Design a binder for this molecule. Sequence first.
Ligand SMILES: Cc1cc2nc3c(=O)[nH]c(=O)nc-3n(C[C@H](O)[C@H](O)[C@H](O)COP(=O)(O)OP(=O)(O)OC[C@H]3O[C@@H](n4cnc5c(N)ncnc54)[C@H](O)[C@@H]3O)c2cc1C
Ligand SMILES: Cc1cc2nc3c(=O)[nH]c(=O)nc-3n(C[C@H](O)[C@H](O)[C@H](O)COP(=O)(O)OP(=O)(O)OC[C@H]3O[C@@H](n4cnc5c(N)ncnc54)[C@H](O)[C@@H]3O)c2cc1C
Ligand SMILES: [Mg+2]
Ligand SMILES: [Mg+2]
Ligand SMILES: [Mg+2]
Ligand SMILES: [Mg+2]
Ligand SMILES: [Mg+2]
Ligand SMILES: [Mg+2]
Ligand SMILES: [Mg+2]
Ligand SMILES: [Mg+2]
Ligand SMILES: [Mg+2]
Ligand SMILES: [Mg+2]
Ligand SMILES: [Mg+2]
Lengths: 471, 463
Amino acid sequence: GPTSFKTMKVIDPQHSDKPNVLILGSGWGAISFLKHIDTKKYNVSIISPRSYFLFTPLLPSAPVGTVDEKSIIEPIVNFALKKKGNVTYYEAEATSINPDRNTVTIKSLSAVSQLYQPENHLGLHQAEPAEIKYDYLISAVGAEPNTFGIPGVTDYGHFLKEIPNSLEIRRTFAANLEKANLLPKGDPERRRLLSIVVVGGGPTGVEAAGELQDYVHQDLRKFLPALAEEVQIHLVEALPIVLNMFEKKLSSYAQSHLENTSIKVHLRTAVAKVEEKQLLAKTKHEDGKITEETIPYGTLIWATGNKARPVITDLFKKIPEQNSSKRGLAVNDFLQVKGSNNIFAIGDNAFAGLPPTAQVAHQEAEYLAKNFDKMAQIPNFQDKIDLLFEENNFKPFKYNDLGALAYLGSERAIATIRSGKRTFYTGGGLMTFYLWRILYLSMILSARSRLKVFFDWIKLAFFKRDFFKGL
Amino acid sequence: TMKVIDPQHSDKPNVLILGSGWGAISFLKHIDTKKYNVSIISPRSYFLFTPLLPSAPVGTVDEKSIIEPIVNFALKKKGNVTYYEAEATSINPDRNTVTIKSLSAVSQLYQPENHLGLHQAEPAEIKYDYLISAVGAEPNTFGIPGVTDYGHFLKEIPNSLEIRRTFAANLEKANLLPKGDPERRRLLSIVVVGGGPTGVEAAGELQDYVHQDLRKFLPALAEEVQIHLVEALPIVLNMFEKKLSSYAQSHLENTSIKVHLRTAVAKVEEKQLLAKTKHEDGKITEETIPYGTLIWATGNKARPVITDLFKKIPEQNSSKRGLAVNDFLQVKGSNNIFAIGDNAFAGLPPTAQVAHQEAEYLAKNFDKMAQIPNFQKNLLFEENNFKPFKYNDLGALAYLGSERAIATIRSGKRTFYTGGGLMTFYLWRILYLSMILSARSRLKVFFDWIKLAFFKRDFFKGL
Ligand SMILES: Cc1cc2nc3c(=O)[nH]c(=O)nc-3n(C[C@H](O)[C@H](O)[C@H](O)COP(=O)(O)OP(=O)(O)OC[C@H]3O[C@@H](n4cnc5c(N)ncnc54)[C@H](O)[C@@H]3O)c2cc1C
Ligand SMILES: Cc1cc2nc3c(=O)[nH]c(=O)nc-3n(C[C@H](O)[C@H](O)[C@H](O)COP(=O)(O)OP(=O)(O)OC[C@H]3O[C@@H](n4cnc5c(N)ncnc54)[C@H](O)[C@@H]3O)c2cc1C
Ligand SMILES: [Mg+2]
Ligand SMILES: [Mg+2]
Ligand SMILES: [Mg+2]
Ligand SMILES: [Mg+2]
Ligand SMILES: [Mg+2]
Ligand SMILES: [Mg+2]
Ligand SMILES: [Mg+2]
Ligand SMILES: [Mg+2]
Ligand SMILES: [Mg+2]
Ligand SMILES: [Mg+2]
Ligand SMILES: [Mg+2]
């Protein structure tokens, strides 16, 4: 009621006169922005429930131990230490963006790290909600896996999005292999347990299926060859082709290689419902006929793209110019959230027609941090900010599509490297796989992680993958 | 009815190994699989290089670096090896059978598959011509209340994970608390119970993490942590020369570890424990020590499957700490069952060093029984003139934190090296690297140490 004692702790740092920049998230957008932001001019704070950066492109190779989970992650604090200014990291979850009081509500607070010598005691307690005040908000919370309303995918499948997904996939499949080996050959249960279904025909599903097939063919086969021969990996894609962002002939090369490695590819197929031990697939053939197949499965990996998070969809309702948003926050040429003077959005929580990739998020981040370099030289910056951008002739953000890669298992990849209308590489094969490796190694954001991936690959040359069920 | 597994395909005798640790694996490496059919029962699918375990909680090495799947040892074997991921619950010497429960998997590493018809979580009995018992010993709380519920043992991979999880959770809460808060000092307190090399290295590793890595980004937090080493004896590291013990304790205290000698834990509660000191004069003082993390790095005791076995063999009722065995590591009262490592008593210390020399010796004895047609058919070792097992102590090593170690290297009566220092620490690393049982594990440890020279240890709460 009106007599409520409601009191939310509000953190509002006003020692210095540097503007307070608040970043939400710890992934491609947030970390890249962090790497470039000038902490000599701004006070930076980061809210994220994940204390590390995740190098996503190598995640599909983590479940089978091609790389280790720890090798592809890097603690926020390690990026923060390399900054000259003051950085604070709230290990917490942003639950509400409050644009009219310039505040972000946080919950599930585990920790706060102030990487500066005269720490001020904030008076926060774990699992007590709070609000962090901001002069500028940079929203990069990303997006979450989409089930498209299909029943059972959450309960019975595994997403391929975060590190614990990698661990669950390994655990489920390892357990399945153990039960299966106890069953006699020809048992359909054994066949089911050794059966893997990967939904999603983009590079993530494809690499996931390729890495799994690699594990089975190169490592499992060495000690349980009979069991290795019976595993069946399915790749299920709703479109007529896989890897539809590549040249159609590279897609065809890819499907053939996949099929040659023994992966069964179902095109024009969508999953209608998922039950504990089987799922229902429907194929929409080119003529127009529709068939149904019931597919027994031991392990289901759901790799089919994302949707806006609740904190973002709630924000849609609170900003008039944003009510009609569906896939992400609508931003202007300068990456300002529309209907806001104060809030910027980069990465997959923003939608501007570009593809939802790290490549985009990383360029957005670099561009935005550079704009913060310029705003810091123009005293009028600290609701006229959209006009200030044009008045000072800031350039709109301009995405340079640099291409795409996909590893296919058994040491084959496809790749198209470009810039502008200039194509520098486009093909597939053995040497494209070496390129896949060198390039991905190059794109890792931290020396440490880069060393670890390198060491993992070296160990892969001499020894089998580590595939521990509980470690 | 009860399933019984008796592989009489071959006339090769069935050697059944229990365990997958220092005894069982060292034996597996030396046994001739062209003369024997080998099976292995163990709830743990991997060998654990125990001496690097204290260095795993803070990520000086990774957990995966110091372990090695049994299967990898078994693929190097020329013959047929079978591994049952299950727990031996009952040795049945009269019928030559081992009962197994909690079965997870069975891996026949041989070309002609036999469907054994086993189901998970379903009791079975494995039959043997020769049994090799090596289930080791389990942690001993010495009847002290609270240690099981409130502390962590330091014996197995899961223990390393638990310690890291407990301590990382503590640093997080503590840092949210205001400086001066006693709950903050409690959360930043670690008590390690055990003054042997294990407890010491555990403490030095935690201290290393605190001073080298945690201090880099939360220096005030790192100053406030207090690590406590509690030891019942009047010196730490009592198997060494007393001068090295003095060097050690003095170093440990110099790194800010508080060392409590002549002190025993009387009882443990959730947030605090009772330590009693018996002074040389004979008086007893007592201290309630608040703690955030308790690591219990002391004590062995025999496992129940070995305890039950006592009351089944005549010459073994009088056994308390292990299986009494003769000069040939044969369990007294059997011609069937041998025992090595911590589950066997023979006057020797319970160490990996002893376990590994026993195993190598025993497998060399099996090289001979396969040359004497009597053992195949037919107190037989005497008449055939098998030399008894002779233990050669090669020395001892202890890392002390902050790049210092102590070491004594010996063979027979001669001592080749005995000291402590900077170089001793480098020696520590080389020796331990040379004692790892597999190329893979050795490589992973080596990379971990290289990585350490350039970067802070990985200390993830949930990985
Ligand atoms: C398995 C996989 C492989 C991929 N491979 C490629 C590839 O090869 N090439 C490519 O271009 N793209 C690839 N992508 C896509 C790329 O990773 C994403 O487009 C990119 O992550 C977008 O960056 P982001 O910062 O918007 O989201 P993310 O990098 O996912 O970061 C979101 C961050 O916000 C945090 N967060 C979540 N909720 C909250 C909240 N409530 N409050 C505060 N923080 C929150 C998350 O923990 C995370 O730290 C891959 C994606 C996946 C899943
Ligand atoms: C942290 C630590 C550090 C150590 N450092 C050293 C050192 O530096 N130098 C040294 O000489 N000694 C050291 N030791 C002692 C050494 O580890 C033991 O003496 C050694 O384990 C003895 O070998 P073992 O084969 O008898 O037992 P273990 O190596 O413990 O092997 C026991 C095996 O049996 C399995 N098992 C358990 N129960 C059953 C069951 N019911 N059925 C079948 N299998 C079962 C276990 O999973 C394990 O695989 C250390 C010990 C610890 C805990
Ligand atoms: Mg982000
Ligand atoms: Mg991510
Ligand atoms: Mg985003
Ligand atoms: Mg995302
Ligand atoms: Mg290999
Ligand atoms: Mg053993
Ligand atoms: Mg062991
Ligand atoms: Mg034993
Ligand atoms: Mg033991
Ligand atoms: Mg506790
Ligand atoms: Mg370090």
